[PDB]
Amino acid sequence: MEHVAFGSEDIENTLAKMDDGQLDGLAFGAIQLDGDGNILQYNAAQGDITGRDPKQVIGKNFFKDVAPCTDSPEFYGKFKEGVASGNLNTMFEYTFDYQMTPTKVKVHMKKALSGDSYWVFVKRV
Template sequence: MKRVRFDSDDMQNALASLSDDEIDNLMFGAIELDADGTILRYNLAESELTGRRPEDVIGRNFFNDVAPCTRSNEFSGRFFRGVETGEFNAVFEYVFDYEMAPTKVRILMIKSAVADTYWLLIKRKFLETTEGDEP
């Protein structure tokens, strides 16, 4: 099994060399979208994070149907500007909160190296607590 780090400098080529099973076994979420935001692949790590099964989300629009909390300039705006301009690579933090407990994540958006598709790679960030906060 190939090991891929979330912060790999050459993530496009790393993903291109992985089988579907290897993408499912990544330790972070991986969602492949077409230029309109339709979900083409949704790996098991992302399924476990969100509680949504791949078979229920593949073929649906990520921004409108699956994660409407991402319909913002910061997220979907960045995605569609990247698709339009061809300058797609971005890294940022976001909070997912649609039909799930608010979850802080780090997002890596990259264009596929071998197809006209786009990847959202998602790594859960653990919220820091201060003394007296509930765990």
């Protein structure tokens, strides 16, 4: 188990050292997106929450293909403003309900340290 707490102030520095195997040891769901919303990384805890198979969703677009319930001003709209501005750090509750039992989660979106990548972190509430 990797010990990093959800919501930690310097989480992007800590997660910069992990490969996909290490990300699978986190206590919470983690998705890495490019600035178009394509999925680059998707960990085991996220798949436990959503039912998706991690290897199968890498390369898909999160907003168009995987998670249409997030294509809303309340989720996608926040992401796209962050990508446009080059800064993003926001936490909110949301319900995931596409092809699954409706599940309430806490979401933390934060710009990654390097380049044009963005984290989505998720835990149950």
